[PDB]
């Protein structure tokens, strides 16, 4: 995020970090409950990857993070890698997330729910801040 | 990439208007937001696009693709969750 601001630590409890075994942050995700994480299909998540919950400062050693194992990867089969259309993948955790003050779920909308153009929303993450 | 979590507000746009930047790359299951002085960038993919509705935050978009430069004047492309939620609800109920 280019032009963002630092979040209040623990204010986006559903935000997770996808790391590979090297410990490198490669994609973000959102917790929808204690056993399921939603991300992008294009992220190419594998079961050797790990989901980190409740983290704020990725260079901190005193944070009580939760590193969760990935049991299974469900890429929507309507996902089109040519167009990147339907870019959603669910991840089934092996180990339930422990919901705390800093670890919670986002709500899913209704297929019918309406988000009007012009509405102001928020996005978060640990993506580049400059290019 | 920054080590602390970052946030940004950004307005949602219509697909129509979005096609002015992107054109045909925009699909029915895509939703644009941004072009407001901020932008999602590399490493933000898979993360949240939330909107407060009835007091709670709800996932409306998933960080997908955009400008190769993360230009803050081009709209970002996010997966439209409203068009994919029937799949998530089916996937959770099966497994």
């Amino acid at each position: 995020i280019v032009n963002g601001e630092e979040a209040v630590p623990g204010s986006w409890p559903w935000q997770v970090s996808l790391q590979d075994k090297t410990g490198f942050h490669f994609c973000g995700g959102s917790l929808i409950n204690e056993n399921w994480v939603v991300t992008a299909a294009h992220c190419g998540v594998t079961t050797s990857d790990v989901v980190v919950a409740g983290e704020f400062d990725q260079g901190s050693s005193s944070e009580k993070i939760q590193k969760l194992k990935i049991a299974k990867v469900f890429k929507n089969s309507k996902y089109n890698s040519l167009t990147i259309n339907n870019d959603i993948t669910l991840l089934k955790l092996s180990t339930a997330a422990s919901f705390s003050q800093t670890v919670s779920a986002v709500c899913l909308p209704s297929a019918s729910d309406d988000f009007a153009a012009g509405t102001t929303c928020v996005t978060t993450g640990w993506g580049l801040t400059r290019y | 990439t920054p080590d602390r979590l970052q946030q940004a507000s950004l307005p949602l746009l219509s697909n129509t208007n979005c096609k002015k930047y992107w054109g045909t790359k925009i699909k029915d299951a895509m939703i644009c937001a941004g072009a407001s002085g901020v932008s999602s960038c590399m490493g933000d993919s898979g993360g949240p696009l939330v909107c407060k509705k009835n007091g709670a935050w709800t996932l409306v978009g998933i960080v997908s693709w955009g400008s190769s430069t993360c230009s803050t004047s081009t709209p970002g492309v996010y997966a439209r969750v409203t068009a994919l939620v029937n799949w998530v609800q089916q996937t959770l109920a099966a497994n």
């Binding site: 979040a7 209040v8 630590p9 623990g10 204010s11 986006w12 409890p13 559903w14 929808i32 705390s100 003050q101 800093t102 919670s104 779920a105 986002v106 709500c107 899913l108 928020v122 | 946030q7 507000s9 939330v50 407060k52 007091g55 709670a56 935050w57 709800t58």
Partner: peptide, 10 residues
Amino acid sequence: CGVPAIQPVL
């Protein structure tokens, strides 16, 4: 869902 314990400060 959607109601964090630590209110986001925008």
